[PDB]
Design an enzyme around this catalytic site. Structure first.
Site, PDB file in Angstrom:
ATOM      1  N   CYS A   1       0.621  -1.150   0.033  1.00  0.00           N
ATOM      2  CA  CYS A   1      -0.102   0.045   0.172  1.00  0.00           C
ATOM      3  C   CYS A   1       0.889   1.360   0.014  1.00  0.00           C
ATOM      4  O   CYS A   1       1.868   1.312   0.894  1.00  0.00           O
ATOM      5  CB  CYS A   1      -0.956  -0.095   1.146  1.00  0.00           C
ATOM      6  SG  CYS A   1      -2.168   1.422   1.236  1.00  0.00           S
ATOM      7  N   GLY A   2       0.542   2.335  -0.834  1.00  0.00           N
ATOM      8  CA  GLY A   2       1.299   3.413  -0.961  1.00  0.00           C
ATOM      9  C   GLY A   2       0.995   4.378   0.185  1.00  0.00           C
ATOM     10  O   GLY A   2       1.851   5.165   0.669  1.00  0.00           O
ATOM     11  N   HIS A   3      -0.316   4.225   0.809  1.00  0.00           N
ATOM     12  CA  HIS A   3      -0.380   4.862   2.097  1.00  0.00           C
ATOM     13  C   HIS A   3       0.357   4.437   3.115  1.00  0.00           C
ATOM     14  O   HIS A   3       0.971   5.395   3.850  1.00  0.00           O
ATOM     15  CB  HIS A   3      -1.990   4.755   2.355  1.00  0.00           C
ATOM     16  CG  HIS A   3      -2.990   4.996   1.306  1.00  0.00           C
ATOM     17  ND1 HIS A   3      -3.307   4.135   0.193  1.00  0.00           N
ATOM     18  CD2 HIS A   3      -3.648   6.283   1.243  1.00  0.00           C
ATOM     19  CE1 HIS A   3      -4.082   5.137  -0.616  1.00  0.00           C
ATOM     20  NE2 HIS A   3      -4.292   6.225  -0.112  1.00  0.00           N
ATOM     21  N   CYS A   4       0.346   3.282   3.206  1.00  0.00           N
ATOM     22  CA  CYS A   4       1.516   2.816   4.245  1.00  0.00           C
ATOM     23  C   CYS A   4       2.870   2.992   3.910  1.00  0.00           C
ATOM     24  O   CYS A   4       3.776   3.387   4.888  1.00  0.00           O
ATOM     25  CB  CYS A   4       1.313   1.236   4.562  1.00  0.00           C
ATOM     26  SG  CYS A   4      -0.182   0.562   4.965  1.00  0.00           S
TER      27      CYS A   4
END
Lengths: 438, 781
Positions: free
Chosen positions: A34-37
């Protein structure tokens, strides 16, 4: 427990140990892809370093929710950048929905430990526009109802409630008696006001009427019937169409969510093609329900104006609004040819014998003179282009799976399996469907 | 106690299984039988008077060869009176003690008398009795007046060789209509219900009317006649006539020009392929070996396949002595030998011990040496599924594969044993496979993952899925995308958990769009086909975080479609074509899967996997047999005439008749790849069902040569002039003829001969794949 950049690493062997040891621990159920993580991990490490370098018991820790899915299944974690915190005896963690940076976490944990105060000489700017939606609580005695207001302030962590005791602030905000006003920067900026009507008022007035469809807004959209609008940003009278959409959104705020999406960007072309509209109508209005079944509804009036789009949600609430299908209707010259076309639009009112052909197959191309001759001899036999239309009763893996339509609408499926000749179908129709069917 | 005058008939029927049709029949052997009685031991004399052969299908009348031939002419001089020569039988408590006759006569004439005397040897019980057939679990069902004798012919111990399958039933309900003391009538139903055939034997012995002293019965047999010597009650193998005449200059020369390489597509050529195999099964070792001494090499692989399809003791020795495994010039002949042994429905341990000795030998070609081990695992897989895993050869072969994979010193041996373990289906290779799946090498792990994909749901546990999770989710390291998708395919198919489906759908979008389109299409194909795993997917999709259109909308070129070519409530056949492309649209792993299912069970009929990178290689599977994968390049592709099924249970009928139920199914394949790229799947199913009843003086036969052609050619119509990849997938089936045959014989060593022919042309349609592919293909249309 493994410590890396002052961040505890939990792999189901120390998560319970870390939470029982560190009372004040920030939890992250992150994922490797995940790019958010990916963006959150340096911020998580920075916040852990800021807490650890200071003399506070609070720290930060990350859990790979992909490899440790039991923690997500027990708690109910449904997002990968989800941030939580477990204190004493079992309670629901504070749903961290604020900015995921380090100093934001530092400011946010103080609210969860057990409102914000600023000097009154902030030129009447900092208290009101500290964040996007900031609420200021006004009370001369900061009691019977003041303590209830403070309890409501402490009920929601993500809302930055304000403390006011100065006399000039009450007059500058024009309040004769005590009250709660929600402030924002998008819709109105000021909304003056059981123990739940205040929370309902704040949640209703905080909600924006129209949302630009972006990656960031997307998790909050499904977190809470999204009537879309594939309006180009460079369309003719974009402002007027957007104002009509806003006036439509004012009619239905919480029950139906209004989202405007730019059809000019190629990244939204997948959203365009999901509904089937290949930018056929730029002001087209489609309503999508995602409650376990994607049913894209079809407005009754394609002559759409501000009033029509406004009351389209009421029409959908009536339940008479039908779903949208890419099935063309009855053709213009169906009466001239002895064999007629009974499309999926007419598959119930007019659909006698039906058949589901396809222009894909070359054997159907060879059978087209044969099916022409059968209809010319029998001058109701229906051919259906199931590649364009849709079959609701059954499915056709082998497309010439003939379903002999009955009389008096007692529908049955009996598969004709002839030799694909100009005489076999005539012999089948000579018996009236009694012989050769099934 | 006195002479009993009975009439006897031997009804032989050869039905096609329609239910009521006199299309083909057999002879009826009739006689008036005189039975005289010569502790519970007793000796009787059975004499055949008025012995003559008549037809039961007298509708034709005088069309047969029974007109103009005397009963002496039909059976010959010696055999007519040999039946009329009396025979003896010793009976103790209704069971055969010992069978006595002159024995200086033909075998088949003795068989009729052996089947004639069995009606007086009968008893509510179950045992392995003594009768004409041998030793079988015989179910005695006694009624209030008569008795029903059911014989489990599967349980029969006889010397006759009895062995994508052929189902059969062998109901042998025999009714001894008995009123007072012995047989007053016999209703012996001998149905062998196995394209199908109902070969029926029946005998009717009806009693009409009736009209040596010694304490020991041992010398009474000699006292009647000295020639009354000991012979078994079970019939023996005989071949009075031509039978399987080898005739290498004559019989093979007839089929030499009917198996040429230039007409292998024609089903008329393949019809002579199955005929010559039937001759070689009843042939000696030197007879088969002499054929290959000076045969032409161009037509030899058909003969090599035909010899290998016999699978007898002498033919296996003949082909092994003919084929020199050290000789590297005959690459194809050993390769055709190995494939036919792999495609043998009944492989033997001596073949396995030979192939083990082949691997222990000095094989010149490593690919053949790899092919031996691939077949070796295939033989082990058939034997371990036939309760033979404890065999001395199997454990030797298992330790070759397991120990060689655990202790590997060469890169080719690991790839050899990975292909071998893929065919082996050994549950103890799972720790090795999961080690190799996470080993970090691309082709090694992908082959191991596809080998793990061959494993079933009981062979994949939560720990195995967790092992493949780190490959797919990439918790610890990076893996190639074909391995992760295959690992994701295993998890979704083999009982996924609620969180497993939950994490996979959330991965969609974060992955590259080349993988995102395929991974979405896999879950999309899960929902369309109403899989049992889709119920868990439906519970995941019930929440709004998984049913969102942001993940469901993806711009890609990959696809995953599955459909039914044919479907029935009893059985169905499925096909699928899940092609995954690269980021630029280049084909990476196209899985053309052909499946067949029969009730609860199912067989993977075929799988052709075309893989490209940048190498170019193909993987071929034929009927649960992973073949040697073929690489086109790195840095007549598939061609063979082979058998599919073989049911050759040589029955011995209760009436004393020799029934040879021989069902054979073969095909000729020619798969060649030319790159606009096409892959052809040419299938010519030729089923020649035969049921011949012979007794060396009357012959009857029934041949059903139901031959069918087929073809499934896929065309990859790709246009790459524009920046988007205009990739159109289309599997086009051409028109193939469909034919049926039926032949009837009634001979007595022209005859009652008839031929029935039917012909049809099957229209072929292009496979539409999915509607998303249909939009790009409609530019061509």
């Amino acid at each position: 427990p493994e410590e890396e950049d002052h961040v505890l690493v939990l792999r189901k062997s120390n998560f319970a140990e870390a939470l029982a040891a560190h009372k004040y621990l920030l939890v992250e159920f992150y994922a490797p892809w995940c790019g958010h993580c990916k963006a959150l991990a340096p911020e998580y490490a920075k916040a852990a370093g800021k807490l650890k370098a200071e003399g506070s018991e609070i720290r930060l820790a990350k859990v790979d929710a992909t490899e440790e899915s039991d923690l997500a299944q027990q708690y109910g974690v449904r997002g990968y950048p989800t941030i939580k915190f477990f204190r004493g005896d079992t309670a629901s963690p504070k749903e961290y929905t604020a900015g995921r940076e380090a100093d934001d976490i530092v400011n946010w944990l103080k609210k969860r430990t057990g409102a914000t105060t600023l000097p009154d000489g902030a030129a009447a700017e900092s208290l009101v526009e500290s964040s996007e939606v900031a609420v200021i609580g006004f009370f001369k005695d900061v009691s019977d109802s003041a303590k209830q207001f403070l309890q409501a302030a402490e009920a929601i962590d993500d809302i930055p409630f304000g403390i006011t005791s100065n006399s000039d602030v009450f007059s500058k905000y024009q309040l004769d008696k005590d009250g709660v006003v929600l402030f924002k920067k998008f819709d109105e900026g000021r909304n003056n006001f059981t123990k739940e009507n205040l929370l309902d008022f704040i949640k209703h007035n905080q909600l924006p009427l129209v949302i630009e469809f972006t990656e960031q807004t997307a998790p909050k959209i499904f977190g809470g019937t999204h009537i879309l609008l594939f309006l180009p940003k460079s369309v003719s009278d974009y402002d007027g169409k957007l104002s009509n959409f806003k006036t439509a959104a004012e009619s239905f705020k919480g029950k139906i969510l209004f989202i405007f999406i730019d059809s000019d960007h190629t990244d939204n072309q997948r959203i365009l093609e999901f509904f089937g509209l290949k930018k056929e109508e730029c002001p087209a209005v489609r309503l999508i329900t995602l409650e376990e079944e994607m049913t894209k509804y079809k407005p009754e009036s394609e002559e759409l104006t501000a009033e029509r789009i406004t009351e389209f949600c009421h029409r959908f609430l009536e339940g008479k609004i039908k779903p949208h299908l890419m099935s063309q209707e009855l053709p213009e010259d169906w009466d001239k040819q002895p064999v007629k076309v009974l499309v999926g639009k007419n598959f119930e009112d007019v659909a006698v014998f039906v058949e589901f052909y396809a222009p894909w197959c070359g054997h159907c191309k060879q059978l087209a003179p044969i099916w022409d001759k059968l209809g010319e001899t029998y001058k109701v036999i229906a051919k259906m282009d199931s590649t364009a239309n849709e079959v609701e009763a059954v499915k056709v893996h082998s497309f010439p799976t003939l379903k002999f339509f009955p009389a008096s609408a007692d529908r049955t499926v009996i598969d004709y399996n002839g030799e694909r000749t100009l005489d076999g179908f005539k012999k089948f129709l000579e018996s009236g469907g009694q012989d050769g069917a099934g | 106690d006195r002479l009993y005058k009975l009439t006897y008939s031997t009804e032989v029927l050869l039905d096609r299984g329609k239910g009521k049709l006199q299309d083909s029949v057999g002879y009826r052997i009739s006689s008036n039988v005189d039975v005289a009685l010569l502790d519970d031991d007793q000796l009787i004399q059975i004499t055949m008077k008025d012995v003559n052969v008549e037809n039961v299908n007298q509708q034709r009348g005088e069309k047969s060869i029974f007109k103009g031939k005397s009963p002496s002419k039909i059976m010959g001089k010696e055999n007519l009176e040999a039946l009329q020569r009396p025979t003896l039988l010793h009976l103790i408590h209704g069971k055969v003690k010992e069978f006595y006759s002159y024995q200086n006569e033909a075998v088949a004439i003795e068989n009729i008398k052996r089947g004639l005397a069995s009606l007086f040897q009968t008893q509510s019980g179950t045992t392995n009795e003594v009768d004409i057939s041998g030793n079988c679990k015989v179910t005695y069902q006694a009624h209030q007046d008569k008795v029903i004798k059911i014989k489990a012919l599967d349980s029969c111990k006889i010397a006759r060789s009895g062995f994508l399958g052929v189902s059969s039933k062998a109901t042998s309900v025999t009714t001894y209509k008995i009123e007072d003391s012995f047989v007053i009538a016999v209703l012996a139903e001998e149905t062998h219900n196995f394209i199908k055939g109902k070969i029926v034997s029946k005998q009717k012995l009806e009693l009409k009317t009736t009209e040596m002293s010694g304490k020991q019965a041992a010398a009474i047999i000699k006292a009647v006649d000295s020639k009354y010597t000991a012979i078994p009650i079970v019939g023996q193998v005989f071949q009075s006539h031509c039978k399987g005449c080898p005739s290498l200059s004559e019989l093979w020369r007839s089929t030499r020009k009917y198996l040429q390489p230039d007409n292998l597509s024609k089903a008329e050529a393949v019809r002579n392929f199955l005929a010559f195999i039937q001759h070689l099964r009843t042939a000696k070792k030197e007879e088969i070996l002499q054929i290959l001494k000076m045969e032409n090499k161009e037509v030899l692989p058909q003969l090599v396949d035909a010899v290998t399809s016999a699978q007898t003791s002498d033919s296996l020795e003949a082909i092994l002595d003919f084929l020199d495994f050290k000789s590297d010039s005959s690459i194809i002949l050993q390769e055709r030998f190995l494939y036919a042994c792999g495609f043998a429905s009944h492989p033997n341990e001596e073949l396995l011990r030979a192939l083990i000795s082949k691997f222990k030998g000095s094989i010149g070609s490593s690919d053949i040496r790899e092919t031996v081990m691939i077949i070796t695992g295939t033989l082990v897989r058939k034997l371990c599924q036939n309760e033979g895993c404890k065999l001395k050869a199997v454990v030797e072969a298992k330790k070759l594969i397991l120990g060689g994979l655990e202790k590997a010193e060469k890169k080719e041996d690991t790839r050899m044993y990975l292909l071998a373990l893929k065919n082996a289906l050994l549950p103890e290779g799972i720790p090795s496979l999961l080690k190799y799946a996470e080993a970090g090498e691309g082709p090694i792990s992908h082959l191991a993952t596809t080998a793990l994909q061959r494993y079933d749901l009981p062979f994949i546990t939560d720990e195995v899925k967790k092992t493949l999770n780190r490959i797919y989710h990439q918790n610890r390291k990076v893996h190639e995308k074909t391995v992760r998708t295959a690992a994701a395919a295993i998890i979704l198919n083999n009982n996924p958990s609620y969180m497993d489906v939950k994490n996979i759908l959330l991965s969609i979008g974060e992955l590259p769009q080349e993988m995102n389109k395929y991974m979405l299409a896999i879950v999309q194909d899960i929902l369309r086909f109403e899989m049992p795993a889709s119920k868990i997917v439906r519970r995941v999709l019930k929440e709004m975080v998984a049913h969102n259109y942001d993940r469901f909308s993806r711009s890609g070129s990959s696809s995953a479609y599955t459909g039914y070519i044919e479907r029935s409530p009893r059985s169905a056949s499925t096909y699928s074509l899940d092609i995954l492309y690269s980021g630029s649209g280049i084909l990476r792993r196209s899985n053309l899967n052909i499946f067949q299912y029969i009730g609860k069970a199912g067989l993977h009929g075929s799988q052709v996997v075309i893989e490209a990178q940048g190498y170019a290689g193909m993987s071929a599977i034929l009927f649960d047999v992973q073949l040697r994968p073929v690489t086109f390049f790195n840095g007549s592709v598939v061609k063979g005439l082979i058998l599919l099924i073989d049911h050759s249970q040589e029955l011995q009928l209760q009436s004393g008749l020799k029934a040879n139920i021989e069902v054979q199914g073969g095909l000729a394949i020619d798969i060649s790849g030319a790159m606009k790229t096409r892959v052809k799947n040419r299938v010519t199913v030729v089923i020649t069902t035969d049921i011949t009843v012979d007794s060396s003086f009357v012959k009857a036969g029934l041949e059903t040569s139901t031959e069918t052609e087929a073809g499934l050619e896929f065309i990859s119509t790709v246009q790459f002039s524009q920046y988007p990849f205009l990739v159109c997938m289309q599997m086009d089936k051409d028109e193939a003829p469909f034919r049926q045959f039926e032949k009837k014989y009634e001979r007595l060593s022209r005859g009652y001969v008839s031929q029935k022919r039917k012909e049809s042309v099957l229209a072929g349609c292009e496979f539409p794949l999915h509607q998303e592919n249909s939009e790009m293909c409609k530019v061509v249309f």
